[PDB]
Amino acid sequence: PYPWSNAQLSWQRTAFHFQPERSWMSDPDGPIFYKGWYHFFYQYNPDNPVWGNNTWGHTVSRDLIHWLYLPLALAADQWYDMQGVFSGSATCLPDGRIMMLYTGVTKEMVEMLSLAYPADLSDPLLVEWVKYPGNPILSAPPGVSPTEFRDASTGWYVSNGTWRIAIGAKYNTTGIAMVYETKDFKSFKLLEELLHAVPDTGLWECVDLYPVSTTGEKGLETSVNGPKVKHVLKASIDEQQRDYYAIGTYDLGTNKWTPDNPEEDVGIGLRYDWGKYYASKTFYDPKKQRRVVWAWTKELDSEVADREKGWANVQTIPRTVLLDQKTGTNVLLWPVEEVESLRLSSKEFSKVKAGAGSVVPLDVGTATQLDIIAEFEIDKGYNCTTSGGAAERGVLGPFGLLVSATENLSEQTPVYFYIAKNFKTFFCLDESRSSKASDVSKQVKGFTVPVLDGEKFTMRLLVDHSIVESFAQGGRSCITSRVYPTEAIYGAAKLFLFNNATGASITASLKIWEMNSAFIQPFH
Ligand SMILES: *[C@@H]1O[C@H](CO)[C@@H](O[C@@H]2O[C@H](CO)[C@@H](O[C@@H]3O[C@H](CO)[C@@H](O)[C@H](O)[C@@H]3O)[C@H](O)[C@H]2NC(C)=O)[C@H](O[C@@H]2O[C@@H](C)[C@@H](O)[C@@H](O)[C@@H]2O)[C@H]1NC(C)=O
Ligand SMILES: *[C@@H]1O[C@H](CO)[C@@H](O[C@@H]2O[C@H](CO)[C@@H](O[C@@H]3O[C@H](CO)[C@@H](O)[C@H](O)[C@@H]3O)[C@H](O)[C@H]2NC(C)=O)[C@H](O[C@@H]2O[C@@H](C)[C@@H](O)[C@@H](O)[C@@H]2O)[C@H]1NC(C)=O
Ligand SMILES: *[C@@H]1O[C@H](CO)[C@@H](O[C@@H]2O[C@H](CO)[C@@H](O[C@@H]3O[C@H](CO)[C@@H](O)[C@H](O)[C@@H]3O)[C@H](O)[C@H]2NC(C)=O)[C@H](O)[C@H]1NC(C)=O
Ligand SMILES: OC[C@H]1O[C@@](CO)(OC[C@@]2(O[C@H]3O[C@H](CO)[C@@H](O)[C@H](O)[C@H]3O)O[C@H](CO)[C@@H](O)[C@@H]2O)[C@@H](O)[C@@H]1O
Ligand SMILES: *[C@@H]1O[C@H](CO)[C@@H](O)[C@H](O[C@@H]2O[C@@H](C)[C@@H](O)[C@@H](O)[C@@H]2O)[C@H]1NC(C)=O
C-alpha cells in the first residue's frame, strides 16, 4: 500500500476523457443522437467511488468529445428499482418517440425490465425522464434466474409494427441471448428460438446485435438487413469481465445468428479491446453515418486510493466500428475523428533509428496529454499475457514506445510489437513497471494482430494522464489500460522510442500532438 499524495492523486484525473465531477461511473447507458446532440447515460453512484446505489447520469455534446453535465436522468426511487437503476438501451421509433428500456432491482435483488421515456420530446437536452406508470413490465422466464435478468439491447425492426430486443443470460454454463418481441414496448413476448448460444462461456451481459457493411465505409442503421450484410454479435462475459464479439450473419425469419467461424464464437474469440474495457454499447450516428462504440475502463489502483481521490473509472474515447474489409474476420475500432479537435500543436520525428537493446528519448515537452501516430520498420509459444514484457528479448522484438516513463526509466509503460515464429505479430501493453507503487495492476496485456504484406507496423496512442489507449494496424487490435505512476507525473513524464530486439534495428517515423482539455463542465 503506497502513501499516495494529493499531488499524485489529482494528477490521475483525465483532461479529455468523459468522467463525472466525482464518484463512481460504470456502464454506458442508452446512447443516442437526438436533435443535434449526442446523448450519453452511465451507471453512477451518487454516494461513493465504489459500485452501488445505481443511478443514470446524463451528459451531452455536439461532437462526442466536449461533454456537458446534466442532472441525473434516473434515480433509485421506485419499489421496483430501489436497489438500483441498472444498465439499458434506447430504441428510437419512426414516429419520433424514444423508448428507454432498463433493468430495475428490487430490495430482494430481483431484476426486472422497466420502461422510461422523456417527459418532453421537444427538449433537445432530454433533461427530464418519466418512468412508465405500469412498471415493471417484464420479469424472468422459467428458465432464467430472476436475480440475473439484465441488459436489454437496442431493438431491431421486423415488420408489421413488431420490434426485437436481446436480453443475455445463461443456461447452466452456456451463454445465451434471448429475443423478445414487442409492438408497444410495454408488453414482451419471448421467442422460442434463442438468438445464439455458446457452451462454457457463462453469463452474457450487455448483449449487442448490430449489422455491418461489407462494401462501404459507413455504419449501418440497426434495423438494416440483407444478403450483402453481416452482423456482429457481442456479449460481455461476466465471469472474465471482458467483452467478446464475433462476425456472422443474422436471419430475420429464423431469428438465429450464426457465426462465420464457430471456433471464434462469442466469448471464445476476439475482443474489441485486449485491456480493461467492459460493457461496450454501440449506437448508430445519423449525422456522420457511423456506428460508434462506448465502453468504460475501470480503475486499476486500490479502492483505498479511489476513496482518497473521491472518484473512480472513466469512459474511453468513443470509437467507430467498421468491418475490416481486408481480412473479413475482424472489426476496425478507431477513435471518433472529433478527438482531433483537441490537438493543439504537432511535432514530427522523421526516420528515427533504434538499434538492438537501445532506448531513444523523444523530446515533446510534457508527455501526459498526447496523441501519437507511429510507423515502424525492421531494417535489413509467445503470449503477451505470460511474457516478461519489454524485458523478454527476442530476435524480432520487442520494439515500440515507452509512455508514462521517468528520466532514468525507473517507471515505464511499454506499448510494443513482437514478431515471433510464418510470422505472428503480437501487440502488447506492459504494466509491470508502470509505477513504483505495489497496490496497482502489473499485468501484461495483448494479443496477435493481423499484419498484411506491404503494411508498415503502425500504432496510435492516446495518452491522457491515468489512461492510455493503444491501436495497432489502424485498429485491428486495441489495448486500453490505466497507469498510476508515482514519479512519472506532471513535467517528469517522458516519452521514449525503444527497441529491445536482438536480431534487428528498427526505423520509426512519429508525429506527436499535445492535447487540450475537453473542458468537461456543467451545461449552461
Ligand atoms: C442444466 O443442467 C441440469 C442438470 O444437469 C439439466 O437437467 C437435467 O436434464 C437431463 C436431461 O438432459 C435429465 O436427465 C435425464 O432425463 C431423461 C429424460 O427422458 C431420462 O431419460 C433420464 O432419467 C435422465 O434423468 C436430468 O434429470 C436433469 N437434471 C436435473 C438435476 O434436473 C438441465 O436440463 C434442462 O432441465 C431438464 C429438467 C430438462 O427439462 C431438459 O430438457 C432441460 O434442458 C440443464 N439446462 C438446460 C437448459 O439444458
Ligand atoms: C495466453 O496466456 C493466458 C494466461 O495463461 C491465457 O489466459 C488464461 O486462460 C486460462 C484458461 O486457459 C484461464 O484460467 C482459468 O481457466 C479455468 C478453466 O479451467 C477457470 O476455471 C479459471 O477460472 C481460470 O480463469 C484464465 O482466465 C486466463 N488468464 C488470464 C490472465 O486472462 C490465454 O488463453 C486465452 O485467453 C483466455 C482468457 C481465453 O480466452 C482462452 O480461450 C484463450 O486461449 C493464453 N493464450 C493462448 C495460450 O493462446
Ligand atoms: C530490455 O531487456 C532487458 C533484459 O531483460 C531489461 O533489463 C532488465 O530489467 C529487469 C526489470 O527491471 C531487471 O530485473 C530486476 O533485477 C533486479 C536485480 O538485478 C531486481 O532488483 C528487480 O526487482 C528486477 O527483478 C534486470 O536487472 C534487467 N536485466 C538486464 C540484463 O539488464 C530492460 O529493462 C529492457 N529494456 C526496456 C524495458 O526498455
Ligand atoms: O452496474 C450495473 C450493470 O453492471 C453490469 C455490467 O458491468 O454488471 C453488474 C455487476 O457488476 C458489479 O459487480 C461488483 C459489485 O459486487 C463489482 O466488483 C463490479 O465492478 C460491478 O461492475 O453487478 C453484479 C453483482 O451485484 C455482478 O453480477 C455484475 O458483474 C451489468 O450487468 C449491469 O447492468
Ligand atoms: C448507498 O447509500 C447509503 C445511504 O445513503 C450509504 O450509506 C451507502 O454507503 C455504504 O453503506 C454505509 C452504511 C457504510 O457502510 C459505507 O461505508 C458504505 O459505502 C451507499 N452505498 C454504496 C455502495 O456506496
Side-chain angles (χ1 to χ4, degrees):
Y2 186 85
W4 297 102
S5 65
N6 301 296
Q8 277 164 333
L9 289 172
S10 69
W11 180 91
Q12 301 177 14
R13 274 199 79 85
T14 70
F16 62 85
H17 285 70
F18 179 83
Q19 200 175 323
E21 258 161 25
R22 57 171 309 267
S23 203
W24 170 279
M25 170 186 64
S26 275
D27 307 18
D29 286 341
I32 42 154
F33 177 80
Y34 187 71
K35 291 213 193 299
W37 285 101
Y38 289 99
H39 283 255
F40 179 70
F41 305 88
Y42 55 94
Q43 294 293 285
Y44 175 74
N45 187 343
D47 303 288
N48 293 101
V50 291
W51 183 89
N53 292 344
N54 306 62
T55 64
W56 276 35
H58 184 203
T59 184
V60 286
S61 65
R62 297 289 193 186
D63 67 354
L64 282 169
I65 296 295
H66 295 95
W67 297 103
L68 301 159
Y69 304 132
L70 290 174
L72 227 72
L74 297 168
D77 54 14
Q78 300 279 75
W79 69 265
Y80 57 82
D81 62 20
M82 198 68 94
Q83 267 299 297
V85 183
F86 279 17
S87 90
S89 310
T91 307
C92 301
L93 303 175
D95 51 16
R97 286 194 291 154
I98 296 162
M99 307 304 271
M100 194 69 72
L101 292 176
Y102 72 88
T103 308
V105 192
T106 79
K107 52 168 188 188
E108 294 169 4
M109 306 307 291
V110 172
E111 301 180 330
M112 290 185 281
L113 201 77
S114 276
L115 167 71
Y117 42 70
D120 184 348
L121 287 163
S122 79
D123 179 13
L125 307 172
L126 299 167
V127 165
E128 283 301 318
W129 286 79
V130 175
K131 297 180 170 174
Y132 176 62
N135 279 342
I137 54 181
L138 184 68
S139 66
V144 180
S145 172
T147 59
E148 199 162 75
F149 185 64
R150 282 160 223 178
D151 302 347
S153 75
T154 285
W156 61 96
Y157 193 68
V158 187
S159 71
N160 203 38
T162 304
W163 292 77
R164 283 178 178 163
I165 59 147
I167 290 168
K170 69 163 180 171
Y171 290 141
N172 295 322
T173 54
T174 313
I176 66 159
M178 286 176 297
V179 176
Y180 286 88
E181 284 189 337
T182 192
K183 286 190 162 172
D184 62 347
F185 281 88
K186 287 156 199 182
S187 320
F188 291 90
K189 193 177 75 70
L190 174 58
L191 293 187
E192 221 177 50
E193 194 81 33
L194 293 177
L195 201 260
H196 194 53
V198 191
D200 301 322
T201 60
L203 171 63
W204 283 13
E205 293 174 336
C206 189
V207 163
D208 205 350
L209 180 76
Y210 59 86
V212 296
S213 180
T214 50
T215 46
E217 283 195 341
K218 302 179 188 180
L220 295 185
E221 202 270 321
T222 327
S223 294
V224 172
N225 212 318
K228 59 173 281 163
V229 165
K230 280 193 192 284
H231 270 250
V232 177
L233 178 52
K234 172 266 157 177
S236 294
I237 306 303
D238 183 60
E239 292 188 349
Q240 296 185 37
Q241 288 291 297
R242 285 134 145 189
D243 292 350
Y244 285 83
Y245 76 95
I247 296 159
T249 49
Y250 170 67
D251 182 328
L252 277 171
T254 199
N255 192 54
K256 296 173 87 180
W257 176 94
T258 308
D260 271 5
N261 181 354
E263 283 187 33
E264 293 212 299
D265 213 326
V266 191
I268 60 166
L270 296 163
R271 305 183 209 167
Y272 284 158
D273 196 296
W274 298 101
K276 202 69 192 139
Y277 192 88
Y278 199 59
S280 50
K281 253 185 214 290
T282 64
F283 73 95
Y284 178 71
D285 169 34
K287 207 178 71 199
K288 283 178 186 185
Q289 294 163 277
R290 309 173 279 188
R291 178 157 297 271
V292 178
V293 60
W294 275 105
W296 67 287
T297 305
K298 199 184 185 307
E299 297 299 307
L300 294 174
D301 64 352
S302 62
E303 192 203 288
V304 175
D306 298 348
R307 283 195 187 269
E308 204 115 55
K309 74 199 183 190
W311 64 273
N313 321 330
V314 291
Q315 300 292 332
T316 72
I317 305 301
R319 297 166 195 170
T320 55
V321 195
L322 285 180
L323 188 72
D324 190 343
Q325 278 163 48
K326 292 179 169 199
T327 64
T329 47
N330 54 267
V331 291
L332 296 175
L333 298 184
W334 199 246
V336 294
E337 62 178 349
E338 292 89 341
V339 75
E340 293 170 25
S341 73
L342 297 162
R343 297 169 169 183
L344 290 158
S345 75
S346 53
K347 186 170 185 179
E348 280 163 48
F349 289 94
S350 191
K351 290 163 181 186
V352 189
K353 286 175 167 178
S358 63
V359 160
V360 185
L362 305 155
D363 183 20
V364 294
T366 318
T368 59
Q369 292 173 198
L370 302 179
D371 188 12
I372 298 164
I373 295 178
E375 55 181 44
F376 298 93
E377 282 191 318
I378 293 166
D379 304 339
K380 322 284 179 211
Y382 191 86
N383 173 338
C384 299
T385 325
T386 57
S387 80
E392 197 188 338
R393 304 187 63 182
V395 194
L396 294 160
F399 59 89
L401 295 195
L402 309 172
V403 306
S404 260
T406 219
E407 283 196 339
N408 62 297
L409 290 181
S410 63
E411 282 176 333
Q412 51 159 246
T413 310
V415 184
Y416 72 79
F417 283 101
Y418 191 102
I419 326 301
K421 279 146 282 186
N422 272 23
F423 284 139
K424 292 202 162 182
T425 306
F426 287 85
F427 188 61
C428 330
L429 192 145
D430 179 21
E431 291 162 13
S432 59
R433 281 174 286 159
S434 300
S435 181
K436 276 180 161 175
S438 74
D439 53 2
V440 293
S441 176
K442 310 280 205 176
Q443 292 165 307
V444 191
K445 287 161 163 62
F447 201 73
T448 44
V449 57
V451 180
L452 310 181
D453 301 14
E455 294 179 335
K456 301 194 173 88
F457 301 98
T458 69
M459 75 166 65
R460 189 186 184 174
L461 288 171
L462 291 172
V463 176
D464 189 2
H465 296 260
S466 70
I467 180 168
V468 197
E469 296 182 45
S470 57
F471 303 88
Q473 305 309 110
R476 294 201 183 116
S477 164
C478 316
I479 314 170
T480 306
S481 183
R482 307 290 300 283
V483 288
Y484 305 91
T486 73
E487 285 162 10
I489 57 164
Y490 298 95
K494 302 294 182 206
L495 189 77
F496 292 91
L497 171 71
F498 90 106
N499 181 7
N500 228 5
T502 58
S505 69
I506 62 101
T507 299
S509 285
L510 302 99
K511 188 165 186 188
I512 296 138
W513 290 269
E514 293 287 333
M515 299 292 263
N516 203 348
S517 181
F519 296 101
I520 302 158
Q521 56 209 333
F523 196 89
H524 321 87

Coordinates of all heavy atoms in Angstrom, one line a residue, residues 219-275:
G219 N -21.4 3.3 -41.1 CA -22.1 2.4 -40.2 C -23.5 2.1 -40.7 O -23.9 2.8 -41.6
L220 N -24.2 1.1 -40.2 CA -25.5 0.8 -40.7 C -26.5 1.0 -39.6 O -26.3 0.7 -38.4 CB -25.5 -0.7 -41.2 CG -24.7 -1.0 -42.4 CD1 -25.0 -2.4 -42.9 CD2 -24.9 -0.1 -43.6
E221 N -27.7 1.5 -40.0 CA -28.8 1.6 -39.1 C -29.2 0.3 -38.5 O -29.2 -0.7 -39.3 CB -30.0 2.3 -39.8 CG -31.0 3.0 -38.9 CD -32.1 2.1 -38.4 OE1 -32.6 1.2 -39.3 OE2 -32.6 2.2 -37.3
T222 N -29.5 0.2 -37.3 CA -29.6 -1.1 -36.5 C -30.6 -2.1 -37.2 O -30.4 -3.3 -37.0 CB -29.9 -0.9 -35.1 OG1 -29.3 0.3 -34.6 CG2 -29.4 -2.0 -34.2
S223 N -31.6 -1.6 -37.8 CA -32.6 -2.5 -38.4 C -32.3 -3.0 -39.8 O -33.0 -3.8 -40.4 CB -34.0 -1.8 -38.5 OG -34.4 -1.5 -37.1
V224 N -31.2 -2.5 -40.4 CA -30.8 -2.9 -41.8 C -30.4 -4.3 -41.9 O -29.7 -4.9 -41.0 CB -29.6 -2.0 -42.3 CG1 -29.0 -2.5 -43.6 CG2 -30.0 -0.5 -42.5
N225 N -31.0 -5.0 -42.9 CA -30.6 -6.4 -43.1 C -30.6 -6.7 -44.6 O -31.3 -6.0 -45.4 CB -31.6 -7.4 -42.4 CG -31.0 -8.7 -42.0 OD1 -30.2 -9.3 -42.7 ND2 -31.3 -9.1 -40.8
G226 N -29.9 -7.7 -45.0 CA -29.8 -8.1 -46.4 C -28.8 -9.3 -46.7 O -28.2 -9.8 -45.7
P227 N -28.7 -9.6 -48.0 CA -27.7 -10.7 -48.4 C -26.2 -10.1 -48.4 O -25.3 -10.9 -48.5 CB -28.2 -11.1 -49.7 CG -28.9 -10.0 -50.3 CD -29.5 -9.2 -49.1
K228 N -26.1 -8.8 -48.5 CA -24.8 -8.1 -48.5 C -24.3 -7.7 -47.1 O -23.3 -7.0 -47.0 CB -24.8 -7.0 -49.5 CG -25.8 -5.9 -49.2 CD -25.6 -4.6 -50.1 CE -24.5 -3.7 -49.7 NZ -24.0 -2.8 -50.7
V229 N -25.1 -8.0 -46.1 CA -24.9 -7.5 -44.8 C -24.4 -8.6 -43.8 O -24.9 -9.7 -43.9 CB -26.2 -6.8 -44.2 CG1 -26.1 -6.6 -42.7 CG2 -26.4 -5.5 -44.9
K230 N -23.4 -8.3 -43.0 CA -23.0 -9.2 -41.9 C -23.4 -8.6 -40.6 O -23.6 -7.4 -40.5 CB -21.5 -9.5 -42.0 CG -21.1 -10.5 -43.0 CD -19.7 -11.0 -42.8 CE -19.2 -11.8 -44.0 NZ -19.7 -13.2 -44.0
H231 N -23.5 -9.4 -39.6 CA -24.0 -9.0 -38.3 C -23.0 -9.3 -37.2 O -22.6 -10.5 -37.1 CB -25.3 -9.6 -37.9 CG -26.5 -8.8 -38.3 ND1 -27.3 -8.2 -37.4 CD2 -27.0 -8.5 -39.6 CE1 -28.3 -7.5 -38.1 NE2 -28.1 -7.7 -39.4
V232 N -22.6 -8.3 -36.4 CA -21.7 -8.5 -35.3 C -22.6 -8.9 -34.1 O -23.6 -8.2 -33.8 CB -20.9 -7.3 -34.9 CG1 -20.1 -7.5 -33.7 CG2 -20.0 -6.9 -36.1
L233 N -22.3 -9.9 -33.4 CA -22.9 -10.3 -32.1 C -21.8 -10.1 -31.0 O -20.8 -10.7 -31.1 CB -23.5 -11.7 -32.1 CG -24.1 -12.2 -30.8 CD1 -25.2 -11.2 -30.2 CD2 -24.7 -13.6 -31.0
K234 N -22.2 -9.3 -30.0 CA -21.2 -9.0 -28.9 C -21.9 -9.3 -27.6 O -23.1 -9.0 -27.4 CB -20.7 -7.6 -29.0 CG -19.9 -7.1 -27.8 CD -20.7 -6.4 -26.8 CE -20.1 -6.4 -25.4 NZ -20.9 -5.6 -24.4
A235 N -21.1 -9.8 -26.7 CA -21.5 -10.1 -25.3 C -20.4 -9.7 -24.3 O -19.2 -9.9 -24.6 CB -22.0 -11.5 -25.1
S236 N -20.8 -9.2 -23.1 CA -19.9 -9.0 -22.0 C -19.9 -10.3 -21.2 O -20.9 -10.7 -20.7 CB -20.4 -7.8 -21.2 OG -20.3 -6.6 -21.9
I237 N -18.7 -10.9 -21.2 CA -18.6 -12.2 -20.5 C -18.3 -11.9 -19.0 O -17.2 -11.6 -18.6 CB -17.5 -13.1 -21.1 CG1 -17.7 -13.3 -22.6 CG2 -17.4 -14.5 -20.4 CD1 -19.1 -13.9 -23.0
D238 N -19.4 -12.0 -18.2 CA -19.4 -11.7 -16.8 C -18.2 -12.3 -16.0 O -17.6 -11.6 -15.2 CB -20.7 -12.0 -16.2 CG -20.8 -11.5 -14.7 OD1 -20.7 -10.3 -14.5 OD2 -21.0 -12.4 -13.9
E239 N -18.0 -13.6 -16.2 CA -17.0 -14.3 -15.4 C -15.6 -13.8 -15.6 O -14.8 -13.9 -14.7 CB -17.1 -15.8 -15.7 CG -18.4 -16.4 -15.2 CD -18.4 -17.9 -15.3 OE1 -17.5 -18.5 -15.9 OE2 -19.3 -18.6 -14.7
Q240 N -15.3 -13.3 -16.8 CA -14.0 -12.8 -17.1 C -13.9 -11.2 -17.0 O -12.8 -10.7 -16.9 CB -13.6 -13.1 -18.6 CG -13.5 -14.6 -18.8 CD -13.0 -14.9 -20.2 OE1 -12.2 -14.2 -20.8 NE2 -13.5 -16.0 -20.8
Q241 N -15.1 -10.6 -17.0 CA -15.2 -9.1 -17.0 C -14.5 -8.5 -18.3 O -13.8 -7.5 -18.2 CB -14.7 -8.5 -15.7 CG -15.6 -8.6 -14.5 CD -16.9 -7.9 -14.6 OE1 -16.9 -6.6 -14.6 NE2 -18.0 -8.6 -14.6
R242 N -14.7 -9.2 -19.4 CA -14.1 -8.7 -20.7 C -15.1 -8.9 -21.8 O -15.9 -9.9 -21.8 CB -12.9 -9.6 -21.0 CG -11.6 -9.2 -20.2 CD -10.9 -10.4 -19.6 NE -9.5 -10.2 -19.5 CZ -8.6 -11.2 -19.2 NH1 -9.1 -12.4 -18.9 NH2 -7.3 -11.0 -19.2
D243 N -15.1 -8.0 -22.8 CA -16.1 -8.0 -23.9 C -15.6 -8.8 -25.1 O -14.4 -8.5 -25.5 CB -16.5 -6.6 -24.3 CG -17.3 -5.8 -23.2 OD1 -17.7 -6.5 -22.2 OD2 -17.5 -4.6 -23.4
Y244 N -16.4 -9.7 -25.6 CA -16.0 -10.5 -26.8 C -17.1 -10.2 -27.9 O -18.2 -10.0 -27.6 CB -16.0 -12.0 -26.5 CG -14.8 -12.5 -25.7 CD1 -14.8 -12.4 -24.3 CD2 -13.7 -13.1 -26.3 CE1 -13.7 -12.8 -23.6 CE2 -12.6 -13.5 -25.6 CZ -12.6 -13.4 -24.2 OH -11.5 -13.8 -23.5
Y245 N -16.6 -10.3 -29.1 CA -17.5 -10.2 -30.3 C -17.2 -11.3 -31.3 O -16.2 -11.9 -31.2 CB -17.4 -8.8 -30.9 CG -16.1 -8.6 -31.8 CD1 -16.1 -8.8 -33.1 CD2 -14.9 -8.2 -31.2 CE1 -15.0 -8.7 -33.9 CE2 -13.8 -8.0 -32.0 CZ -13.8 -8.3 -33.3 OH -12.7 -8.1 -34.1
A246 N -18.1 -11.5 -32.2 CA -17.9 -12.4 -33.3 C -18.7 -11.9 -34.6 O -19.7 -11.2 -34.5 CB -18.3 -13.8 -33.0
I247 N -18.1 -12.2 -35.7 CA -18.7 -11.8 -37.0 C -19.5 -12.9 -37.6 O -19.0 -14.0 -37.8 CB -17.6 -11.3 -37.9 CG1 -17.0 -10.0 -37.3 CG2 -18.2 -10.9 -39.3 CD1 -15.6 -9.7 -37.9
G248 N -20.7 -12.6 -38.0 CA -21.6 -13.6 -38.6 C -22.7 -13.0 -39.4 O -22.7 -11.9 -39.9
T249 N -23.8 -13.9 -39.5 CA -25.0 -13.5 -40.3 C -26.2 -13.7 -39.4 O -26.3 -14.7 -38.7 CB -25.1 -14.2 -41.6 OG1 -24.9 -15.6 -41.4 CG2 -24.1 -13.7 -42.6
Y250 N -27.2 -12.9 -39.6 CA -28.5 -13.0 -38.9 C -29.7 -13.0 -39.8 O -29.8 -12.2 -40.7 CB -28.6 -11.8 -37.9 CG -29.9 -11.7 -37.2 CD1 -30.4 -12.7 -36.3 CD2 -30.8 -10.6 -37.5 CE1 -31.6 -12.5 -35.7 CE2 -32.0 -10.5 -36.9 CZ -32.4 -11.5 -36.0 OH -33.7 -11.3 -35.4
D251 N -30.6 -14.0 -39.6 CA -31.7 -14.2 -40.4 C -33.0 -13.8 -39.6 O -33.3 -14.4 -38.6 CB -31.8 -15.7 -40.9 CG -33.0 -16.0 -41.8 OD1 -34.0 -15.4 -41.7 OD2 -32.8 -16.9 -42.7
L252 N -33.7 -12.8 -40.1 CA -35.0 -12.4 -39.5 C -36.0 -13.5 -39.4 O -36.7 -13.6 -38.3 CB -35.6 -11.2 -40.2 CG -35.1 -9.8 -40.0 CD1 -35.7 -8.8 -41.0 CD2 -35.4 -9.3 -38.5
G253 N -36.2 -14.3 -40.4 CA -37.2 -15.3 -40.5 C -37.0 -16.4 -39.5 O -37.9 -17.0 -38.9
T254 N -35.7 -16.7 -39.2 CA -35.3 -17.8 -38.4 C -35.0 -17.3 -36.9 O -35.1 -18.0 -36.0 CB -34.1 -18.6 -39.0 OG1 -34.0 -19.9 -38.4 CG2 -32.8 -17.9 -38.8
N255 N -34.6 -16.0 -36.8 CA -34.1 -15.4 -35.6 C -32.8 -15.9 -35.1 O -32.3 -15.5 -34.0 CB -35.2 -15.4 -34.5 CG -34.8 -14.5 -33.3 OD1 -34.6 -13.3 -33.5 ND2 -34.8 -15.1 -32.1
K256 N -32.1 -16.7 -35.8 CA -30.8 -17.3 -35.5 C -29.7 -16.4 -36.0 O -29.7 -15.9 -37.1 CB -30.6 -18.7 -36.0 CG -31.6 -19.7 -35.4 CD -31.5 -21.1 -36.1 CE -30.4 -22.0 -35.5 NZ -30.3 -23.3 -36.1
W257 N -28.7 -16.1 -35.1 CA -27.5 -15.5 -35.5 C -26.5 -16.7 -35.6 O -26.4 -17.5 -34.7 CB -27.0 -14.5 -34.5 CG -25.6 -13.9 -34.9 CD1 -25.4 -12.8 -35.6 CD2 -24.4 -14.4 -34.5 NE1 -24.0 -12.6 -35.7 CE2 -23.4 -13.6 -35.0 CE3 -24.0 -15.6 -33.8 CZ2 -22.0 -13.8 -34.9 CZ3 -22.6 -15.8 -33.6 CH2 -21.6 -14.9 -34.1
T258 N -25.7 -16.7 -36.7 CA -24.8 -17.8 -37.0 C -23.4 -17.2 -37.2 O -23.3 -16.3 -38.0 CB -25.3 -18.6 -38.2 OG1 -26.7 -19.0 -38.1 CG2 -24.4 -19.9 -38.5
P259 N -22.4 -17.7 -36.5 CA -21.1 -17.2 -36.6 C -20.4 -17.6 -38.0 O -20.7 -18.7 -38.5 CB -20.3 -17.9 -35.5 CG -21.1 -19.2 -35.2 CD -22.5 -18.9 -35.5
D260 N -19.5 -16.7 -38.5 CA -18.8 -17.1 -39.7 C -17.8 -18.2 -39.4 O -17.5 -19.0 -40.3 CB -18.1 -15.8 -40.2 CG -18.9 -15.0 -41.2 OD1 -20.1 -15.3 -41.4 OD2 -18.4 -14.0 -41.8
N261 N -17.3 -18.2 -38.2 CA -16.2 -19.1 -37.8 C -16.6 -19.6 -36.3 O -16.3 -18.8 -35.4 CB -14.9 -18.5 -37.8 CG -13.7 -19.4 -37.4 OD1 -14.0 -20.5 -36.9 ND2 -12.5 -19.0 -37.6
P262 N -17.2 -20.8 -36.2 CA -17.6 -21.4 -34.9 C -16.5 -21.4 -33.8 O -16.8 -21.4 -32.6 CB -18.0 -22.8 -35.3 CG -18.4 -22.7 -36.7 CD -17.5 -21.7 -37.3
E263 N -15.2 -21.6 -34.3 CA -14.1 -21.6 -33.4 C -13.7 -20.3 -32.8 O -12.8 -20.2 -32.0 CB -12.9 -22.2 -34.1 CG -12.9 -23.7 -34.3 CD -11.6 -24.2 -34.9 OE1 -10.5 -23.6 -34.6 OE2 -11.6 -25.2 -35.7
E264 N -14.4 -19.2 -33.3 CA -14.2 -17.9 -32.8 C -15.5 -17.2 -32.4 O -15.7 -16.0 -32.7 CB -13.4 -17.0 -33.8 CG -12.0 -17.5 -34.1 CD -11.1 -16.3 -34.5 OE1 -11.3 -15.6 -35.5 OE2 -10.1 -16.1 -33.7
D265 N -16.4 -18.1 -31.9 CA -17.7 -17.6 -31.5 C -17.7 -16.7 -30.3 O -16.6 -16.3 -29.7 CB -18.6 -18.9 -31.1 CG -20.0 -18.7 -31.5 OD1 -20.6 -17.5 -31.4 OD2 -20.7 -19.7 -31.9
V266 N -18.9 -16.2 -29.9 CA -19.0 -15.2 -28.8 C -18.5 -15.7 -27.5 O -19.0 -16.7 -27.0 CB -20.4 -14.6 -28.7 CG1 -20.5 -13.4 -27.8 CG2 -21.0 -14.3 -30.1
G267 N -17.4 -15.1 -27.0 CA -16.8 -15.5 -25.7 C -15.6 -16.3 -25.8 O -14.7 -16.3 -24.9
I268 N -15.4 -17.0 -26.9 CA -14.1 -17.8 -27.1 C -13.3 -17.3 -28.3 O -12.5 -18.1 -28.9 CB -14.5 -19.3 -27.3 CG1 -15.4 -19.6 -28.5 CG2 -15.1 -19.8 -26.0 CD1 -15.5 -21.0 -28.9
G269 N -13.4 -16.0 -28.7 CA -12.7 -15.5 -29.8 C -12.1 -14.1 -29.6 O -11.3 -14.0 -28.6
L270 N -12.4 -13.2 -30.4 CA -11.8 -11.9 -30.4 C -12.5 -10.9 -29.4 O -13.6 -11.1 -29.1 CB -11.8 -11.2 -31.8 CG -11.0 -11.9 -33.0 CD1 -11.5 -11.4 -34.3 CD2 -9.5 -11.7 -32.8
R271 N -11.8 -9.9 -29.1 CA -12.3 -8.8 -28.3 C -12.2 -7.4 -29.0 O -11.3 -7.3 -29.8 CB -11.6 -8.7 -26.9 CG -11.6 -9.9 -26.1 CD -10.9 -9.7 -24.8 NE -10.3 -10.9 -24.3 CZ -9.4 -10.9 -23.3 NH1 -9.1 -9.7 -22.6 NH2 -8.8 -12.0 -22.9
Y272 N -13.1 -6.5 -28.7 CA -12.9 -5.1 -29.1 C -11.6 -4.6 -28.6 O -10.9 -3.9 -29.4 CB -14.0 -4.3 -28.5 CG -15.4 -4.4 -29.0 CD1 -16.5 -4.0 -28.2 CD2 -15.7 -4.8 -30.3 CE1 -17.8 -4.0 -28.7 CE2 -17.0 -4.8 -30.8 CZ -18.0 -4.4 -30.0 OH -19.3 -4.5 -30.5
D273 N -11.2 -4.9 -27.4 CA -10.1 -4.4 -26.7 C -9.5 -5.4 -25.8 O -10.2 -6.1 -25.1 CB -10.5 -3.2 -25.9 CG -9.3 -2.3 -25.5 OD1 -8.4 -2.8 -24.7 OD2 -9.3 -1.1 -26.0
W274 N -8.1 -5.6 -25.9 CA -7.4 -6.6 -25.1 C -7.0 -6.2 -23.7 O -6.4 -6.9 -23.0 CB -6.3 -7.2 -25.9 CG -6.8 -7.8 -27.2 CD1 -6.7 -7.3 -28.5 CD2 -7.4 -9.1 -27.3 NE1 -7.3 -8.1 -29.4 CE2 -7.7 -9.2 -28.7 CE3 -7.7 -10.1 -26.4 CZ2 -8.3 -10.4 -29.2 CZ3 -8.3 -11.2 -26.9 CH2 -8.6 -11.4 -28.3
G275 N -7.4 -5.0 -23.3 CA -7.1 -4.4 -22.0 C -8.3 -4.3 -21.1 O -9.2 -5.2 -21.2

